[PDB]
Amino acid sequence: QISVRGLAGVENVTELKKNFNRHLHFTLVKDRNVATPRDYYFALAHTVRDHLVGRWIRTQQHYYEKDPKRIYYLSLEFYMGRTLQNTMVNLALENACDEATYQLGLDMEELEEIEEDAGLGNGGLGRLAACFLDSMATLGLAAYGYGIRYEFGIFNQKICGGWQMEEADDWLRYGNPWEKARPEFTLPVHFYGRVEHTSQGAKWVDTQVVLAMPYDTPVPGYRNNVVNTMRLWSAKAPNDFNLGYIQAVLDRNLAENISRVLYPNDNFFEGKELRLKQEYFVVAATLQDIIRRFKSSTNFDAFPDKVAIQLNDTHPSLAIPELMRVLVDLERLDWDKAWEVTVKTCAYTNHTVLPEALERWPVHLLETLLPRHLQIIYEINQRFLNRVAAAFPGDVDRLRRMSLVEEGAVKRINMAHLCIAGSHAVNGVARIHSEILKKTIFKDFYELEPHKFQNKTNGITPRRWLVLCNPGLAEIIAERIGEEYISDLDQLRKLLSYVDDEAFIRDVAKVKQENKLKFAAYLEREYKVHINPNSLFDVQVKRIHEYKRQLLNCLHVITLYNRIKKEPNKFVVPRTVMIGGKAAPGYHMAKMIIKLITAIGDVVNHDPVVGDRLRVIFLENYRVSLAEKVIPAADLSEQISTAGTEASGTGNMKFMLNGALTIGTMDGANVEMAEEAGEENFFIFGMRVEDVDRLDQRGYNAQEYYDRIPELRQIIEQLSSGFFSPKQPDLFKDIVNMLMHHDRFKVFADYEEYVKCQERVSALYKNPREWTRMVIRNIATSGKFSSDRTIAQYAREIWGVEPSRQRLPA
Amino acid sequence: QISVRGLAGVENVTELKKNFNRHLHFTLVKDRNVATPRDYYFALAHTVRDHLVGRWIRTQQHYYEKDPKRIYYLSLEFYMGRTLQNTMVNLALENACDEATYQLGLDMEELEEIEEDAGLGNGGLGRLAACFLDSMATLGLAAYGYGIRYEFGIFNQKICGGWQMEEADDWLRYGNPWEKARPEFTLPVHFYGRVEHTSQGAKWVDTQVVLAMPYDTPVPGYRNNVVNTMRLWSAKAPNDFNLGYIQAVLDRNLAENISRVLYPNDNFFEGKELRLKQEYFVVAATLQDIIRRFKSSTNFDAFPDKVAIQLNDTHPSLAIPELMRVLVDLERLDWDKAWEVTVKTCAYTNHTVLPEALERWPVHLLETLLPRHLQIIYEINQRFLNRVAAAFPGDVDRLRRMSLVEEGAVKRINMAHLCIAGSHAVNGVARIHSEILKKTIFKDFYELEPHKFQNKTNGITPRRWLVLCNPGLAEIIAERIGEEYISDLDQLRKLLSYVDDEAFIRDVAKVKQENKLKFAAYLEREYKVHINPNSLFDVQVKRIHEYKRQLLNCLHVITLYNRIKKEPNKFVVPRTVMIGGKAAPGYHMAKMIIKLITAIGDVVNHDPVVGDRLRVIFLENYRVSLAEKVIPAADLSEQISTAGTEASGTGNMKFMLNGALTIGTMDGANVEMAEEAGEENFFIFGMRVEDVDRLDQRGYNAQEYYDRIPELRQIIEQLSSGFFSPKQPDLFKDIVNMLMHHDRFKVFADYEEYVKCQERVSALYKNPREWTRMVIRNIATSGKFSSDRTIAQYAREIWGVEPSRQRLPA
Numbered sequence A, B: 001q002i003s004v005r006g007l008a009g010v011e012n013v014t015e016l017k018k019n020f021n022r023h024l025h026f027t028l029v030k031d032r033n034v035a036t037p038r039d040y041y042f043a044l045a046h047t048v049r050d051h052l053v054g055r056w057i058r059t060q061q062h063y064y065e066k067d068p069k070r071i072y073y074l075s076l077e078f079y080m081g082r083t084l085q086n087t088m089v090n091l092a093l094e095n096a097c098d099e100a101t102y103q104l105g106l107d108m109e110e111l112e113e114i115e116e117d118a119g120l121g122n123g124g125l126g127r128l129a130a131c132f133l134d135s136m137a138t139l140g141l142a143a144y145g146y147g148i149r150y151e152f153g154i155f156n157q158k159i160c161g162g163w164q165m166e167e168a169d170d171w172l173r174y175g176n177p178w179e180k181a182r183p184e185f186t187l188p189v190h191f192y193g194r195v196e197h198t199s200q201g202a203k204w205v206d207t208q209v210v211l212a213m214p215y216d217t218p219v220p221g222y223r224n225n226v227v228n229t230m231r232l233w234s235a236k237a238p239n240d241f242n243l244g245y246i247q248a249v250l251d252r253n254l255a256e257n258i259s260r261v262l263y264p265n266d267n268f269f270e271g272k273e274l275r276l277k278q279e280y281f282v283v284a285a286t287l288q289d290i291i292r293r294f295k296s297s298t299n300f301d302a303f304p305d306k307v308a309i310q311l312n313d314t315h316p317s318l319a320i321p322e323l324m325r326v327l328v329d330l331e332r333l334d335w336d337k338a339w340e341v342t343v344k345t346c347a348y349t350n351h352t353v354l355p356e357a358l359e360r361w362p363v364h365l366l367e368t369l370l371p372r373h374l375q376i377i378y379e380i381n382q383r384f385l386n387r388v389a390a391a392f393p394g395d396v397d398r399l400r401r402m403s404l405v406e407e408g409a410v411k412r413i414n415m416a417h418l419c420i421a422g423s424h425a426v427n428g429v430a431r432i433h434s435e436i437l438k439k440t441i442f443k444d445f446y447e448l449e450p451h452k453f454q455n456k457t458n459g460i461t462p463r464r465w466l467v468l469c470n471p472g473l474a475e476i477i478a479e480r481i482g483e484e485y486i487s488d489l490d491q492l493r494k495l496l497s498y499v500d501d502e503a504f505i506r507d508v509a510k511v512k513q514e515n516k517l518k519f520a521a522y523l524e525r526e527y528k529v530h531i532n533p534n535s536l537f538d539v540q541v542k543r544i545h546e547y548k549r550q551l552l553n554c555l556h557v558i559t560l561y562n563r564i565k566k567e568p569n570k571f572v573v574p575r576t577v578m579i580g581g582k583a584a585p586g587y588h589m590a591k592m593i594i595k596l597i598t599a600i601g602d603v604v605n606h607d608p609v610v611g612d613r614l615r616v617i618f619l620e621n622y623r624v625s626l627a628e629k630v631i632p633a634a635d636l637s638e639q640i641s642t643a644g645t646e647a648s649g650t651g652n653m654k655f656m657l658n659g660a661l662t663i664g665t666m667d668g669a670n671v672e673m674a675e676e677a678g679e680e681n682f683f684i685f686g687m688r689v690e691d692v693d694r695l696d697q698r699g700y701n702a703q704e705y706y707d708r709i710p711e712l713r714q715i716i717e718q719l720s721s722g723f724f725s726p727k728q729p730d731l732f733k734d735i736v737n738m739l740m741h742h743d744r745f746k747v748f749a750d751y752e753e754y755v756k757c758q759e760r761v762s763a764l765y766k767n768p769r770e771w772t773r774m775v776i777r778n779i780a781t782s783g784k785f786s787s788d789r790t791i792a793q794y795a796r797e798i799w800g801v802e803p804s805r806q807r808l809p810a
Ligand SMILES: OC[C@H]1O[C@@H](c2c[nH]c(-c3ccccc3)n2)[C@H](O)[C@@H](O)[C@@H]1O
Pocket: A122, A124, A125, A128, A265, A266, A267, A268, A269, A313, A351, A352, A357, A429, A458, A646, A647, A648, A649, A650, A668
């Protein structure tokens, strides 16, 4: 059908069809007369997977021949989503498979919808790991993703009476055709025990053994014939484990619980033992694997020339004391040499400045679970503080602040401090965030080792986030400037010379309308709701958080509703306001915000005076595959975090790439996005970081805003009196009380500027031609936000490897 | 190589090799330079499995077209062993696969040894189910095996310091290529709740839901192109299950525990809730499946014309009240009509008369777990006892004895009584056992419904138990009389005309010597022990039990040792005494017997005066794949149960088929085996059932035997004084005390006759020609003990279906 989906050669289509029927018969043991769509999806998955295998074997082969430096990306999260369409895109099989399935009387798009999301992540951090693996494969780096094969990923979200209910994401029920179990590379992981000191150093003894069994998933690069590996570990009990008899066998579950379930907190720290076990489990098994591979080429001087370990936040911070333990206790290197190797090997990416997200593990936990790692952490701390003392003599305050050990009722290890001490590079994930790390939480560390601190602004893979999710847009771009841009997104600047072309303006606007029609129909089919596709699609999709200020959006929505009721017969630009996202199950306030959003929807969507002029939709079960549907359908992207709270964001970039205008604060990567496009092409409002600081010094009094803004007072009165909760008048008292007395994120401080800025959005939407010209200026400058740029920068400035766009042979 | 292994056609071998390399590349994602023997085994398994698939699909297809009466074999146990060689035998692929693997530079026998036993059974009962499925497929019956996919089968047995240690049988670690998950046929199973009575009858409400997910394993018939299905259910939690969040997800394990582990008791009842859950789980899911299949052809009059349900012991007895519950509560049949359907559908196989093995479930357990089933059991009991009262007026004693409810401190349901009431046929498993059921435990039931009681003498599949395990013997037989006998074992009688043929005598004796050389070498390689292959191989392999009297064997072994020490320089026929078997983990006395066997071995095997004249070996981890090795190597089969305790036995038949002479009691199928061969061709000794009864009436005084037999007194003195346990003199006090005061199985009563009979065995072994002529008379009359005979009898006399030996098309 479309050019960027590749060729459907007669030979190719014939072979896909005979192999589809082969898998249906032999692999699935079905005849055509009993096959369900699920069977047909599986037969297609096995057929496409067959095209990965030779390329996978040859890539791993080639890395053995060439022995390049190897990148290990350690993350507790890989938010992969569906694999089938991504695999077809990267192997140029998409049109062939469409043709092949079409001729067997099947609709490939219908089969794609059967695949479960691999939801092994919470949001931005997990999805950044998935975009990174894609770019690492596309740039020909000998890169391995290492994490945990959770049996249960991020929970499925149901709305019941407007409340979030959680249910278990049983993503493996029907099998995962993409993974290959490697039970032959199973490795022991140790817990508990105690430390004996002998003549020949320290010995970790009387430990509990859990087995780590790896599952390999292929990561195909974009048409370069490179297939990298994501290795995920699964917890297994040893067979002599607990070994009356029956109970011992049933108690195997205690050990296997380690890999059972993803912790569902976004940008929040829960200090639970099971979480600590997950962190050690992935680090211990991964480092044994790294070292085994290194030794198959006594001398660890060359370790950092052959190995880079990237730490995705502090979650795998124990890689630092673990590497020391292996090098000192088992390989018998002296401390100083082992430490040199560790620092040149490890690099740390910080993702947040929110204090409630920073990992601070109680010492009693580490003491019981990892007694040796705690001894090593104490030794790191002493030698680290001896360097601080020598550089800043007499600055006892500095020693206290920089300590890896925090004093208090309970002593804690500051895992961020451990990561900075033990890494040659510390990076933030957007320029403003990296600047904030050097001015505030890590100022002391910056003054000691300025050279360690870098910026690597986040990116998104334009394969998933344009070609895959928005083929129509990819095609009209490819008509004008060709296909090269998909692996070189900077080429999108060539589109600035089409900003006054009538045909291109028409085509950009037609694709957006087609995406909106397609999304509006998806809503009717799967969730019986009737949206006006001529309306402006105002979309805020991200995890539910106070700092992301869904509540600010709620205040705008209620303002639009109150303005319609005041002057019913006046023209307003019609809007579909769509808000979606999961709350962490224990985050009470996030669960209350979901309930308020649906409560507003119940009043607004059933007011006859409002008509189709204002619709409020809560998008259920927001996940990667729903993002692929709604982001191409969006006109306005809502990026409205309090300045200084959103480290980067990556939703922001997805919408920029897909032809939505951004209303946002100068927060995270919003700042670089406005710089790339021009501020006049961005709906910027509200406090800068500097303004938030001034308000904090003076003191935030929400009452002042309530007393000065009648429109805002009216909304707070509506919430309090039960306008939005007639049966339970007091339902939202916790929300009002927080906004008036305990708002860390200063929602009222940005209310007036937000509403005025939303009026400018409405005004521009009335002029479709100028709306679309501004869209083109955004798409055309979105090239910086490719994760290919991000990874090339990690590779050159941190890992010391040169990316490559050259094909491996097929 | 040998004719009964089929043809190795040039076309066939070429295709096996290209498909082996296809699976190695695409299925296993390995190149040849990294493949382990385990990879090569898997590539061969996937290649052979490809030959099953078309035949499997067409067989299930054919049963839909023809809609024959369908047999459902319900068992908690299927002791399948390895599948690879059995599949090749039944598809005639064995020589082709040998040739194909040979040309790729691999030894097929080495790859066969990598396959894990499917050990989803304890011993005789589980293995009878496996032999039955094979014969049902071979006789073209539309038969389904239904059971539980245990994650852990019968435990692996390690000997440590001569003690049994148990470790978890993790048989799925590396994957099962033979099974096909069918998550699309997942069915709900209900537990707990309560009963509401409404206008429209009883309703089971507020239940806990566990999901049953089926796994299908193919059961190929012998060269008839029939492939039947074994469906095993796995416990899965529903996704709203327990639905703070983390703990709810981890608590899913409580529901999935149902299918976690096989209860490892042979011929013993443990009244545990988890065991009761396993029994209902398999019955509830199976009956929904049976009924779904029946409805795809309102009218249940024809149910028994389309459905037979065979109950393998009382373990699935709840099929009776469950079928009633479905027919009455859900389908709204009247009681009387539903009961008629149930009785004509169900048949019950009894496997034991040992009181400690009979299932008697406490009422409080059924009351909590299955409240409705208990109401139905009470209703069955009342109507059943009303028939007894009418047939035997005034016989109140009879009413008490026949009740399904036993009175006592705790009330119990007698599941055997439930099975007889609810079945049109009750069978024992050997003629003497079936006679004992009518004279003793079921005399009352026999007098009410004489017509229900049948015999179906057990059998073994000559595919696994001759062709597969003893190709050399199968071949020399096939040289004389052809291949037909493999599916018609009665044809072995034609061998009686070769009993005076010198060439055949030579060939029978050569195969036995080759099997002994091969077994002796297997012992050295895997367990560093040096046996004389010229010695008589005296083998007792079976579960460790008091009733099976391994202790009697021990007393003989110690007698031979004491006779050598008394007269060191006298000639004795050399013996390798091999005893093997697992004890149930909680069976203290069985664990003590293992320790005594190894304690005897430590004294005997290290006495220089003994030399290679007497060796005592404990065969570790006795299981199906060890039986396939040791049974062909055996000269003497030990079947020495107290008369009336061994319902049938099936080990006895395996050895008869494989050229061993039997020393045994007139117990179980030993009686029919001696009748078939002639008593003069059998080493029969000891009390008959009648003699045991006489001793019981008089009273068993073990002291009398100890006082009258000096040789026996000496052995008991050795055990007591620590001759066999120098470091712990009192180690065996429990064994002596039981033999002297509490021996239910009368070991001393059979000691003198056993030793004298063992002297006759030694005397015949000195005359190899006459030993082998007696072996030929045994092999030649073993045809009755084919499970093909057994199943043809079940089919004609119970299920009302005609077996067939006609090929399906390929
Ligand atoms: O860099 C990837 C994205 O990372 C997110 C993040 C921080 N911290 C976490 C987390 C923390 C604990 C457990 C799970 C996730 N996730 C930031 O909030 C985004 O601003 C940024 O875009």
